[PDB]
Amino acid sequence: KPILYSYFRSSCSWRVRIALALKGIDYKTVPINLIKDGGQQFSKDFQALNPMKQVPTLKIDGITIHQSLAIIEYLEETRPTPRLLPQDPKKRASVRMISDLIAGGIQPLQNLSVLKQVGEEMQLTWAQNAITCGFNALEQILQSTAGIYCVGDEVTMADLCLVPQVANAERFKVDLTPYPTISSINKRLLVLEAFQVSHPCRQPDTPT
Template identity: 55%
Template sequence: MIVLFVAIFSPSTQLPIIEYLEETRGSSGVSLLPKDPVKRAHVRRLSEIINSGIQPMQNLSVMRQLPPEVNRDQWHIILFHGCFFTAFEKELEKLAGKYCVGDELSMADVCLVPQVYNAFRFKVDLSPYPIIRRIYTVLMEVEAFKKAAPDVQPDSIG
């Protein structure tokens, strides 16, 4: 779980953290929410699909609740294919440009990267999702995403 402590504010979920940073420090870097209200709504919707749809299902607390007969690798394959990537790819067909929503980085891109990383980790076949794969490839060329990759972190267990 990611926790940010700033003064007395301590959100413990990703979207409030991102939005808080956007609202308090947005002008000092890349804005993750488009100025256009329609695009902003699309970004928030895509981010919420990830935040409330797939991300909670990958938490260790949820994984521990699975019955012992459930194969964890199969769980992730079903989760990614059945519950997330198919629906997300369909949304991207309507919205994507270079990134998830048009041609500017957004909160949706920040939310997507860890999900694709986990899909690779669990050897999920991403060939049915060309837009997701393309966006992920483009994002992984962005310096900030390279520096944030889990396997380059000092505490990474590989």
């Protein structure tokens, strides 16, 4: 049974939960509380599992994999159907570019451990600017790549990164009015079963 180390409120974990649900893969969750006392991401045990001290980490087929996108691509290659990546290389480049923009160009800057180093007074502003600067660019890219979803008319890895990042944007009270395409796609994705069963509000570690 695959084991996913996750935190119900982490955008990075939600990306993998969506992929596991779309792929119909049953998995066990081992929650890692990122906020209580330095959180468990620093306990001696989790650190030995993932030295970067972050979630998600996935145990599957007898191996341990860190990095949400590396995990999602592993799942795409090992359980092909239903596909999370298109067939055409140019459309695959749009999916990867959008995925990397969010996961490597926006989220890292508003990651908890970076916000802790920034100082309470500047946190909200720091997170907001990382997100508005990233969405300013993403919304422009989407004008070109988007159909029903981020790239064309099928759900892809880029969409698994857009939904969690938008929830983050809502948490930091970012005004999404400047981004109608992101918002439109976000709404369409949220009604899908894979984005509901994997939601932060329905995890085993979600507070009662």
